[PDB]
C-alpha cells in the first residue's frame, strides 16, 4: 500500500518488520529493492543483491537484475554491472536501454546506435496506448524517451571536442521544463555522468541538492553537498568551512539552519562574510564583467541571511535593532535593484519606529 | 593533578556543569521565550526567579550562595544579561541567557579542544569505538586502556582526522591539557602500543556548589592443469556465434582459464548451446588458453561480429 | 569523391569547386524550371555532407537562397531542399540562430494542416536535426501551442516504422515538459 502512495521511507520499515522478525519467501526481499532504488541508497542495495545473487531461482533473479544493475551503475563498479545486464530481458525497454549505456562506457559507438534505435520502437507501444487517455497519463513514458535522446548527445559529446561548451548548455534549459520530481532528476542526472563529472557543473547539481532538501529527503541533499566540497564539514567543527567555490559553501550553510545545527550555521556565516571583503579587495586583476558582479551578487544574499537569523535567534532587542540595520544597509548597496533587499530594510525601519513609540508611551 | 589539571580541567568542568544545568533548566522550563510590552525576547529566564529554583533543588542554600555561583559563571562568560550590558547577576527579575544559546558564544582554543574531546569520548563510550578495555602494559592493568597505535589507526579509519600527521599533532594539545594521559609515564602520543588512560570522564558532571564485489559461479577452484592434460572427461567443442541487433549476450570472467560467467537465456549464445559451465582456450583462431579475462574481453570485442569460440564443455563431471 | 579528396590537396580543387558552386546558385535563381532546381539542390548537399570545413563560412549565400525557394508563390524540389538544410544545420552549430525562428513556420506548415499527404519523413527528420544543433529546445512549445498535439497524433495515424522512430526522437530532443505547463499553453 505504501508503494502505491509513492511514500517509500515508511514502506522500507514496513518491509523490515516483516523480514527482521523472520526471513520469508523471495517476495518481501524483492519489495525492498524497489524501495532502496527509489530512495537512492546504492550502498545498501549492492550488498543485498550481490549476496543473494546465487541462492535464488533463475526466474526470481531475472526480476532482481534491473534493480541490481542500477545500483552497480550508481556505485561505479563497472566490472560487475556487465554481469547484471545480461539477464535483463532483451525484449523490453529497460533491456535495451541498460545495455546501450553499457556500450558507451566501454567505447563501442556503432553497437550503441542500434540499441538506441531498438529501444525507440519498443517504447512506441507503451507510448501510443498511454497517449490515448491524456497527456498526464503518458508522462512516465515521455520522460523515458527524453533520456533516449540524451544518449545520442553523449555520443556527440565524446566524438567532437569543439561542442563540449553548448552541449552542457542545452542540458540546462532542457532540465527546466521537466517536472520537479526527485526520482525523475535522479535518472536523468545519472545518465549525464558518463561524460561530465559533478565538479564540471555546479550550476545543475546545486539546484538538485536544493530540490532534494526542499521537498524530499534531507539526508540525500547532504551527501551530495559533501561530494562537491571534497571534504565533510560535519566531521570537524572547529575548522573553518572551505573557502573555494563560494556558491557551494553558501548552500551548505543554508542546509545547517534547516537542520538542528542552527547554532553552528550562524557562527560560520559570520566568518564567511568577513573573509569575503578581504578576498574582494587585494585583487589587482580586474574581472568586473562577470566575476566582480558575481562576487557582489553573493554578498547581498549573505548579509540578508545574517540579519534574519540574528533576529530569529535573539529577537527584536534594543541592542539587536541597530545591529541588523548595519547588515541590511550594507546588503542594499552591494546589489541594488533587488526587491528583497529594499523591502526588508524598509520594513525593519518601520518596525523600529513602532517599538520606540510603544516604549516612550509607557 | 598539577597545574595542567587544576587550570584546564576546572575550566572544562564548569562548562560541563553549565551544559548539565542548562539541559535541566530547559526541561524545567526556566528558560523560555518571553515578550515584554509587545516586544519579544527569546530563550529568556528571569534572574530573581531562578534563585528559588536552585533553593528547591538544593543547588544554592540561600541568596548569597546563588549570587556567588552566578558571579563566578559571569567571570567566565557562560551567561550574559539580555536587557543590559552590565552582565552582573542581580536578585531582580531580569532576563538572562547562556552564551551557548548563541547570544554571544565566544569560543577559545580550550573550548574547541574540550568540545571535540567530549564528542570523541562519547564515541569512545559508544560501541562504535570499543577500544576502551582493561589492558596491561608495564605490568599494571588499567581501565579505559586503548593502544596509542590503535587510536591513531582509529582516527584515520573513523575520519575525525583523516591525515595521521594532523591527528598526531592534535593529540599533543589534548595531552597538554591532560584529557588523555599515557597510563604509566604520560609518554607523548606516538604511533606505538602505549596504552592510555582517559583522565577526563564525561559522566558524573560536577555540582554547581562545587564551583561483496564479486560472486563466482563455477565450483572448481582451478581447472587449468586438468584441461591441459589430455585425459579428462572434458570433450572440446567449437561454437561459432553470429551477432545480434543488441549484442551476443555472453560474459567471460575466468582469470586463467577464462570460463564463461553468464549467458543470456534469450540471447543468441544460449540458442547455440553455450552453457554457463564452460571453458574457452581459443577465440577466432588465436589461442587464449593463458591470459587474463580482461585481455580476452578486449580482443573479442575488436574482432568481427561473428566469433569463432572453442568451449571446453565438461561432460557433467 | 572530390570533396573528400579536396581536404588533402587544395592547391588544384578549390578553383573548380568554386566555379561549380556558382553555377548551382545561378541555376537556383535564374532557371525557372522545377527539374533543374531539384538537380542542383541534391548535388549541393553531397558537397556539404562530405566537405564540411570548406562550406561552413558559406552559410549566408546558401541558406538564404534555400529559404526563398521554400516560399515560392512540385514534390521533387521540396523533398531535396529540406534534406539539404539537414546537413547545413550540422555544419554550423549555434550559427543558425537568426534563421530558426523563420524556419519553423515553413516546416510546421508542412506537418500541421498538411493539405497533401506528401512525404512528412523529411520534414520530421529535419525538424529534429536543426533543434539538436541550434540548441533551441524548450521555448518552441510556447509560441506554437499545437506542436505537441500533432506529434502525438502522428503516433497512432502513421504506420511506417521510419516515421514512427522519428516522431519519438523529436519528442525527446524538444523536452519532457510537465503536464501543467501543457495546460498553461492550452
Amino acid at each position: 500500500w505504501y508503494e502505491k502512495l509513492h511514500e517509500w521511507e515508511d514502506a522500507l520499515v514496513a518491509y523490515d518488520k516483516k523480514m527482521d522478525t523472520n526471513k520469508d519467501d523471495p517476495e518481501l526481499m524483492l519489495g525492498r529493492m524497489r524501495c532502496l532504488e527509489a530512495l537512492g541508497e546504492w550502498g545498501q542495495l549492492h550488498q543485498q543483491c550481490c549476496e543473494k545473487w546465487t541462492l535464488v531461482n533463475d526466474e526470481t533473479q531475472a526480476k532482481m537484475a534491473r534493480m541490481a544493475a542500477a545500483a552497480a551503475w550508481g556505485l561505479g563498479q563497472w566490472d560487475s554491472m556487465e554481469e547484471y545486464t545480461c539477464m535483463i530481458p532483451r525484449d523490453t525497454h529497460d533491456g535495451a536501454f541498460y545495455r546501450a549505456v553499457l556500450a558507451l562506457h566501454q567505447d563501442l559507438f556503432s553497437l550503441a546506435q542500434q540499441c538506441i534505435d531498438k529501444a525507440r520502437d519498443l517504447l512506441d507501444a507503451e507510448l501510443t496506448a498511454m497517449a490515448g487517455e491524456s497527456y498526464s497519463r503518458a508522462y512516465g513514458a515521455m520522460v523515458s524517451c527524453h533520456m533516449l535522446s540524451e544518449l545520442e548527445e553523449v555520443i556527440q559529446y565524446k566524438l567532437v571536442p569543439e561542442r563540449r561548451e553548448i552541449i552542457r548548455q542545452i542540458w540546462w534549459e532542457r532540465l527546466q521544463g521537466c517536472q520537479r520530481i526527485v526520482e525523475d532528476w535522479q535518472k536523468i542526472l545519472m545518465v549525464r555522468s558518463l561524460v561530465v563529472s559533478p565538479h564540471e557543473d555546479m550550476r545543475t547539481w546545486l539546484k538538485y541538492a536544493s530540490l532534494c532538501g526542499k521537498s524530499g529527503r534531507l539526508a540525500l541533499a547532504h551527501k551530495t553537498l559533501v561530494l562537491l566540497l571534497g571534504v565533510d564539514p560535519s566531521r570537524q567543527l572547529d575548522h573553518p568551512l572551505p573557502t573555494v567555490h563560494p556558491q557551494v559553501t553558501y548552500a551548505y550553510m543554508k542546509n545547517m539552519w534547516k537542520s538542528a545545527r542552527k547554532i553552528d550555521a550562524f557562527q560560520h556565516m559570520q566568518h564567511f562574510v568577513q573573509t569575503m571583503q578581504q578576498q574582494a579587495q587585494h585583487a589587482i586583476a580586474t574581472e568586473d564583467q562577470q566575476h566582480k558582479q558575481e562576487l557582489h551578487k553573493l554578498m547581498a544574499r549573505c548579509f540578508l541571511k545574517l540579519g534574519e537569523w540574528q533576529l530569529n535567534l535573539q529577537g527584536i532587542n534594543e541592542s539587536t535593532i541597530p545591529k541588523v540595520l548595519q547588515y541590511y544597509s550594507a546588503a542594499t548597496e552591494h546589489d541594488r535593484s533587488w526587491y528583497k533587499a529594499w523591502h526588508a530594510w524598509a520594513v525593519m525601519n518601520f518596525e523600529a519606529v513602532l517599538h520606540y513609540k510603544h516604549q516612550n508611551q509607557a | 593533578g598539577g597545574a595542567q589539571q587544576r587550570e584546564l580541567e576546572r575550566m572544562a568542568e564548569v562548562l560541563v556543569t553549565g551544559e548539565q544545568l542548562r539541559l535541566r533548566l530547559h526541561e524545567e522550563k526556566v528558560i523560555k521565550d518571553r515578550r515584554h510590552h509587545l516586544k519579544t525576547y527569546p530563550n529568556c529566564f528571569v534572574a530573581k526567579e531562578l534563585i528559588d529554583w536552585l533553593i528547591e533543588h538544593k543547588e544554592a542554600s540561600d541568596r548569597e550562595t546563588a549570587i556567588k555561583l552566578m558571579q563566578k559563571l559571569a567571570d567566565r562568560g557562560i551567561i550574559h544579561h539580555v536587557c543590559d550590558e552590565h552582565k552582573e547577576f542581580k536578585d531582580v527579575k531580569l532576563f538572562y541567557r547562556f552564551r551557548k544559546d548563541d547570544g554571544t558564544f565566544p569560543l577559545d582554543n580550550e573550548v574547541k579542544a574540550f568540545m571535540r574531546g567530549q564528542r570523541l569520548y562519547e564515541k569512545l563510550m559508544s560501541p562504535e569505538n570499543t577500544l576502551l578495555q582493561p589492558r596491561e602494559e608495564e605490568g599494571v592493568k588499567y581501565e579505559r586502556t586503548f593502544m596509542a597505535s590503535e587510536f591513531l589507526d582509529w582516527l584515520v579509519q573513523e575520519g575525525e582526522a583523516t591525515t595521521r600527521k594532523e591527528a598526531e599533532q592534535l593529540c599533543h594539545r589534548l595531552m597538554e591539557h591532560g584529557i588523555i594521559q599515557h597510563v604509566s609515564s604520560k609518554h607523548p602520543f606516538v604511533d606505538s602500543n602505549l596504552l592510555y588512560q582517559f583522565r577526563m570522564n564525561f559522566r558524573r558532571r560536577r555540582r554547581l556548589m562545587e564551583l561483496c564485489n564479486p560472486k563466482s559461479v563455477l565450483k572448481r577452484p582451478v581447472t587449468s592443469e586438468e584441461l591441459l592434460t589430455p585425459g579428462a572427461p572434458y570433450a572440446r567443442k567449437t561454437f561459432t556465434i553470429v551477432g545480434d541487433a543488441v549484442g551476443w549476450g555472453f560474459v567471460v570472467r575466468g582469470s586463467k582459464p577464462c570460463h564463461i560467467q553468464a549467458v543470456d537465456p534469450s540471447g543468441p549464445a544460449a540458442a547455440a548451446g553455450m552453457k554457463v559451465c564452460q571453458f574457452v582456450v581459443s577465440v577466432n583462431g588465436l589461442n587464449v588458453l593463458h591470459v587474463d579475462y580482461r585481455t580476452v574481453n578486449n580482443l573479442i570485442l575488436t574482432g568481427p561480429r561473428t566469433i569463432v569460440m572453442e568451449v571446453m564443455e565438461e561432460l557433467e563431471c | 569523391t572530390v570533396g573528400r579528396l579536396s581536404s588533402m590537396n587544395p592547391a588544384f580543387v578549390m578553383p573548380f569547386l568554386r566555379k561549380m558552386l556558382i553555377q548551382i546558385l545561378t541555376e537556383l535563381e535564374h532557371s525557372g524550371i522545377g527539374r533543374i532546381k531539384e538537380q542542383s539542390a541534391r548535388m549541393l548537399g553531397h558537397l556539404v555532407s562530405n566537405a564540411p570545413r570548406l562550406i561552413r563560412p558559406y552559410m549566408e549565400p546558401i541558406l538564404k537562397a534555400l529559404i526563398l525557394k521554400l516560399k515560392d508563390p512540385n514534390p521533387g524540389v521540396i523533398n531535396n531542399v529540406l534534406a539539404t538544410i539537414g546537413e547545413l544545420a550540422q555544419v554550423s552549430g549555434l550559427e543558425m540562430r537568426k534563421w530558426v525562428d523563420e524556419l519553423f513556420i515553413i516546416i510546421m506548415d508542412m506537418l500541421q494542416d498538411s493539405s497533401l499527404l506528401a512525404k512528412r519523413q523529411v520534414a520530421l527528420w529535419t525538424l529534429g536535426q536543426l533543434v539538436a544543433s541550434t540548441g533551441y529546445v524548450v521555448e518552441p512549445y510556447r509560441k506554437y501551442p499545437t506542436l505537441l498535439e500533432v506529434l502525438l497524433n502522428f503516433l497512432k495515424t502513421e504506420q511506417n516504422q521510419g516515421t514512427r522512430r522519428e516522431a519519438i526522437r523529436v519528442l525527446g530532443l524538444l523536452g519532457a515538459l510537465d503536464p501543467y505547463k501543457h495546460k498553461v499553453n492550452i
Binding site: A103, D107, L108, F109, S110, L111, Q113, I155, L159, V160 | G243, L301, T302, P304, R305 | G45, V48, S49, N50, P52, A83, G86, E87, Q90, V91, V122, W125
Partner: peptide, 14 residues
C-alpha cells in the same frame, strides 16, 4: 563491419 567503428560526422538522409 564491426561494433567499435565511429560514425561519420555529417550523417545524410536515409
Amino acid at each position: 563491419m564491426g561494433f567499435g567503428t565511429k560514425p561519420r560526422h555529417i550523417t545524410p538522409f536515409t
